[PDB]
Every structure is written in structure tokens, then in C-alpha cells.
């Protein structure tokens, strides 16, 4: 009776958000709506966890925001990976790919 | 490329290894080095750190192993509640994979 850790739930939310960011520019609710629809029945999205990660990536210069137009009031905030954020994200998926391969190799060693 | 793997990556690998049975820190490092063709050397201090955190909540226990070549290693094992935790850990990550498939398919 030891619950799975908060750090893991954050890591999984991080993975999903980064995967969505990898697909291209988007508005925040656009991301959220896509994740909720895909998550329904699989995982309860913690909106606060998602928000926290979003804000951290922005503060860290991995994503930057812009407006879809220049008329104040009622706009959707869009976000894109920056120069360094693209690099960070590519490293993130590459490093997880290396893990995936190690697990496959461990599985194959175990079965030998 | 950063000096260390992400904690979540080290945890994933450690939990996969321990799912297979009891092990000691050098042994886990050696098996993961082998499985990576020498390319991934997990951080021994990180492993000890993770084990201390898991032992705190009863997920892992430890003991001094059978003597080999003049001494004993400190083995770690998942307990019964630890295998439960581990199953829920891997299940949650399986759900991530399903979510990604749903995003890919737009369904």
C-alpha cells in the first residue's frame, strides 16, 4: 500500500505534453482538449500538473508564447518550441528511445 | 548530450530490472551496461538514492547476500507491496502509450 509517486505522474504528463509540442504550434486549450479527448478512459489528466509543466517550460525558455492576432481582448495564446526548446525536446525523445532499446535488449537477454 | 539520464529514465530501468528479481547495485549497472552495448552507465549514487526512497515506503527491502569470493553484496528486492506499486507504475506508463496511440490516430 504505497502509492505511485508524484514524480512519475509529472513525468508522464511531461511526456504527453512534449509529444504534442513536437507536432507543432498550438494554442493552450487546443493542446489540453486534444490530451483530454485522448486520455478519456485511460488516465485522469491533472490539469494542475499540466499547467505547472507548461509554465516551467516557458520560464526555462523551452516554449515561447505569441498572439494569433494583434487586437487585444479575446485572443488564444499560442505556444511554440524555441530554438533551445526544439533541441531539448529532441534530446528528450532520443534519450527515451535509448531507454526503450535497452529494455528491449534486457527482455531479449532474459529470454535467452 | 547531458551528463545524466533523467531520474524518470533511471527509475524506469531500475524498476524493470528489479521486477526480474533480487539484485545488487554493481550487478544492475553491469546488466544495463551490457544491454546498452557499453553505452549507458547508470549512476551508482542515484541508484542508492532511489533504493533509500523506495525502502522508506516498504517497496524495496534489502539483505546481505550469500558470500561470493570472500564477501557479501547488499541485495535489494521488491516486496509484495513493492510488486504492487511496480505493477501500477508500469500500468500507468502503458496508459501513456495508449494515449499517444489515440493522439496519433486522432481517436
Residue numbers in the entry:
A (entry chain A): 1 to 112
B (entry chain B): 4 to 110
Paper text:
In previous work, we have introduced pAF into lactococcal multidrug resistance regulator (LmrR), a small homodimeric protein harbouring a pore that exhibits promiscuous substrate binding capabilities, either by direct incorporation using the dedicated orthogonal translation system (OTS),19 or, preferably, by introduction of p-azidophenylalanine (pAzF), followed by a post-translational Staudinger reduction. Incorporation of aY into protein scaffold LmrR gave rise to an artificial Friedel–Crafts (FC) alkylase exhibiting complementary enantioselectivity to a previous FC-alkylase design using p-aminophenylalanine as catalytic residue in the same protein. X-ray crystal structures of the parent and evolved designer enzymes suggest that the introduced mutations cause a narrowing of the active site and a reorientation of the catalytic –NH2 group. Position V15 resides inside the pore of LmrR, and is the same position of ncAA incorporation as used in earlier works featuring pAF as catalytic residue.
In a following round of evolution, SSM libraries of two additional positions in the neighbourhood of the ncAA, i.e. M8 and N19, were prepared using V15aY_RNY as template (S8†). Several variants from both SSM libraries performed better than the parent, of which mutant V15aY_RNY_N19W (RNYW) showed the largest improvements, giving 98% yield and 93% ee when used as purified protein. Remarkably, while V15aY exhibits the characteristic LmrR structure, forming an open pore at its dimeric interface of similar shape and dimensions as observed in other LmrR structures, the V15aY_RNYW_KK structure appears to be more closed and exhibits a narrowed cavity. Furthermore, a significant difference in the rotameric state of the aY side chain is observed (S11†). In contrast, in the evolved variant it is placed closer to the pore centre, directed more towards the central tryptophans. The narrowing of the dimeric interface in the evolved variant can be directly linked to the RNYW mutations, which enhance side chain packing between the α1 and α4 helices. The enhanced packing is stabilized through a combination of hydrophobic interactions, aromatic stacking, and hydrogen bonds. Notably, L18R forms hydrogen bonds with M89N, N88 and N14 in the evolved variant, which may explain the epistatic effect observed in catalysis when the L18R and M89N mutations were combined. Hence, this suggests that the RN mutations are key to forming the observed narrowed dimeric interfaces that appear to be beneficial in FC-alkylations, while the introduced Y and W residues most likely further fine-tune the structure and the interactions responsible for achieving efficient and enantioselective catalysis. Moreover, the close proximity of D100 to the aY residue suggests a potential interaction between the carboxylic residue and the substrates, similar to what has been proposed for V15pAF_RGN.
